[PDB]
Structures are given as structure tokens and as C-alpha cells.
């Protein structure tokens, strides 16, 4: 689909499974509106968040609930969640992958944006 | 001081200088309230955000305006900003350093928390 | 296969395509011996490096030729290559993914190790 | 001095203290020669590796013994060490900082290169 999220675990060397991911879109009135959400699969990936028809240009926030993930693994972590804010631009046909690599006191995120 | 932010640039191999950093605290009514802010120095570090008296337990967000930083370097980047949300807990005397390593489509952040 | 490498580009937000990857194994005499090698595909992934029969316990080094990759993109980077050294242990059936996220002056690497 | 190394711990949110760091230089015969080495201080930093007189252009490898560091903290990690290979070039007066952020299955490294 146009938007995928993948989450990896740097402490156990594994995909981060069953992580809640929320996508919000900035609405015309400058509030965050719920856009899509889901939980990562056993490969750490979350597919099927949205469709080409629903995913329009705008400012999006991807919120990953890293706190609940770590607690389910027996870890009480530093961050409340990991979040990523970015603009989706139509200049071409695009697909976005937001990936995050998690540790208890750190995270990395990157975006892969490709043209089909 | 109890809270320091440092920002590095992975494209030029340099501290990220003159980056705007905003700290917000969650208020009793669950909105973000401006708490402190500043701009990184030539070493990439932002000192003097707050004092021991002002920095209480709570939920804080550190927002780094990476978009303006990249544009001043001639780069139009992916993220709108980089932000870090975490709980400050009194269990002991603590000092927090929030560091971020920036690229145009990615960033890393980590926290260093030490007891003086 | 038991060993996969994936390489991402943090400057362009894209898989790192056609990157040379060399795998070495430490031999009984403590030299590095060429074990397997290949180039990443259009998805940034390198499959088919080795087989279950050939991939034994040992100490492996994965060397990614990031210098040639950046130069082909018009960038003269800091590192000569990115390399990752680790032990493969038989304690169970295992599959290893070595991933790397590249910038001109920085890189991240992580390992995903799963049991089929 | 012209070359500094700093090491941070993403699992405990702390500088990585007492970590052994080895610097090697490629000699005329294409072997690695020991150049300098030391152990990180309580701030995670290793100062005083070398002098302006000794630090010449060349190809250097910085090897961080992350395995012993994790084991002293009670963790049996994935990597044998973290290493960083790069060219030092005289085009100007330069100072190099090699920083590494460590987790049990991942690490990040970046370089900060500045002109005094
Ligand atoms: O992108 C992937 O599909 C992938 C798969 C396995 C491991 C890592 C992956 N990316 C990755 C994402 C971040 Cl944020 C950092 C790093 Cl070192 C790799
Ligand atoms: O923390 C420091 O003081 C520092 C100084 C120079 C370079 C890097 C530093 N940290 C660092 C921070 C992140 Cl987020 C990632 C990485 Cl590899 C290093």
C-alpha cells in the first residue's frame, strides 16, 4: 500500500512484533486527526494501513507505542513512544516506508520513499 | 543544568549549529505547555535550558526544528522536525542529555541520564 | 537463505542499490577467508549469499563497500566501508539479517536473528 | 587532541565507561599497525590518544571492544566489537571525533570533523 511501517528491536535482535502504530494527519484547523492505525506483524511490518485513494498530500505523524512493546518484553523504557512527522508530497507516484530501530533509551528512524 | 540537548549532522560530519530546540511539558489538562527553548551553540549543544528548581517530574517533549536547519544548509529534508517524548522521574538526583543525529531522511536520538 | 544483508540510504531515502557486500569467515589460523559476496538488488537486499550447508558456526565479518556506493551517487564520503563482525552460534536453527543505514559521515547497523 | 572517541550505551542511557578502544593505521605494506589505544573515561570519552605530530594522513581503523563492555554489564552481545575505518586527509587543519552508540544487537557510529 502507499504507507508501510516496520519496527525492529536492537536489544533482542528481532522484529518488534505486535507494536501499536497510529498514523495522524494534520487537518485544515491544525489539529491531528486519526488517519490509520494497526499493529506490526511477526516480521515487524505493518501493511494495509491505507489505500492510494485515502492517502493524500498532507502532514502526517506516525506514532509507535514503544512503551507498551518494551513493557511486554519485561523492560521499563525511557521514551513514551517514538514518533515521526513528515510531509507527503504528490510530486510523482510515491510509496513511503517508515522504519524504526528501538532500544530502551534510544531509537532511530528512517524513511524509504520510492516511485512505482 | 538538569537538561541538555546536543545535535549532530551526519551529512557534513559536524555539530548542528543554531538549531532551534523547544521543550514542552504536559500540563494537568493534557496539553503541551512551552517549558524552555533555545538554539544550539557552535559545538551543537544547548545548555542553560532550565534550572533544578524549574525542572520537575513530568512528561516532556523535546522538539528539534530540523527542517529549518537543513534548509539553511541548502537541503530540503523529509521530516518536519525531530521530537522526543519521555518521562522525567525523581527516583534520585538526575541530569538528562537528549542527543540527536540528523540526516535528510533519518534521525537517531538517544538519552543519557546520569546521577550527580 | 541463512544470511541476508540489507542496505538503506539515509540521504536519498531509498534502498542502497548495487552495493558490493563481502562476507569473510575467520579461519583456523586467525586470518579472514572469503566466504561469500554479492551486490544488493533494487530493494536494497542481498539474498542467496550462502546455504544452510555452507554457513557454519564461526566468526564472520560483513564488509559493505559504502565508498563506491556514495561515489556512484556523486558523494565523496568519510568511511572506507562499513563492516560488522559477529559470531554465528548453532544454539538452535537460526537465520541472520545484517542491515545497515548509511549516511556520508555515519552509519547504523543492526542484526535480526530469527529461528525458523 | 586531533582524535577523540566517545561511546554511549543505548540500553542503560549512560556513557559507556572503561571501554577499550584501539586505533590502527594502515602501513605502507597494507597491514594494520597499532597506532594508539586507551579506555573511555566516566564521561564515555577517550582523550589523549595522539598528538598533532603523530597523527598523519592515512587510513585508520578505530576498534571498540564492545564485547567486553557488555559482558561487564551482564550482557552477552551479538558483535565481537565495533569498528570504523576512514581516511584522514590533510586538506586543512582537522580534528576528528568518532562516536558510537551501542546496543546488544546494533550500533551506530558517526564522525564529527572540525577545523580549529
Ligand atoms: O528496513 C528493513 O526492511 C530492515 C530489515 C531488517 C533490519 C533492518 C531494516 N532497516 C533498518 C532500519 C533502521 Cl531505522 C535502522 C537500521 Cl540500522 C536498519
Ligand atoms: O553525545 C555526544 O556528546 C556526541 C559527540 C560527538 C558525536 C556524537 C555524540 N553522540 C551520538 C549521538 C547519537 Cl543520537 C548517535 C551517535 Cl552514533 C552518537
Author numbering:
A (entry chain A), B (entry chain A), C (entry chain A), D (entry chain A): 10 to 125
The authors write:
Transthyretin (TTR) is one of three plasma proteins that is responsible for the distribution of thyroid hormones (THs) in the blood of vertebrates. TTRs are homo-tetramers, assembled from subunits of around 127 residues that have a β-barrel structure formed by two four-stranded β-sheets. The four subunits come together as a dimer of dimers to form a central channel, which contains the TH binding sites. Human transthyretin (hTTR) can form amyloid deposits that accumulate in nerves and organs, disrupting cellular function.
Of this series, the dichloro derivative VCP-6 was found to have the greatest affinity, five times that of T4. The structure of hTTR in complex with VCP-6 was solved in the I222 space group with one TTR protomer in the asymmetric unit. Notably, due to the crystallographic symmetry, VCP-6 fitted into the binding site in two overlapping orientations with an overall binding site occupancy of 60%, with each orientation occupied 30% of the time. Ser17 interacts directly with VCP-6 and displays dual side chain occupancies with 38% occupancy orientating the side chain towards VCP-6 and 62% with it oriented away from the ligand, forming an intramolecular polar interaction with its corresponding Ser117 in the B domain. In the co-crystallized hTTR complex, VCP-6 binds in the forward mode, with the dichlorophenyl ring bound deep within the channel center. The 3′,5′-chlorine atoms make contacts with four polar atoms in domains A and A’; the backbone carbonyl of Ser117 (O…Cl 3.3/3.2 Å); the backbone carbonyl of Ala108 (O…Cl 3.7/4.2 Å), and the amide nitrogens of Thr119 (N…Cl 3.9/3.9 Å) and Leu110 (N…Cl 3.8/4.0 Å) forming favorable halogen-bonding interactions. The 2-carboxylate group is coplanar with the aminophenyl ring (−70) and one oxygen atom forms an intramolecular hydrogen bond with the amine bridge (2.65 Å), which stabilizes the conformation of the diphenylamine ring system, while the other oxygen atom forms an intermolecular hydrogen bond (2.7 Å) with the Nζ of Lys15. A comparison of the crystal structure of the hTTR:tafamidis complex with the VCP-6 complex reveals that tafamidis also binds in a forward mode in the same position along the channel with the dichlorophenyl rings overlapping in the half-occupancy models for refinement. However, unlike VCP-6, the interaction of the carboxylate with Lys15 is much weaker (5.0 Å). In the co-crystallized hTTR:VCP-6 complex reported here, VCP-6 is positioned deeper in the channel than T4, and is similar to the binding of the deiodination product, 3,3′-T2, which has a weak binding affinity (0.6%).
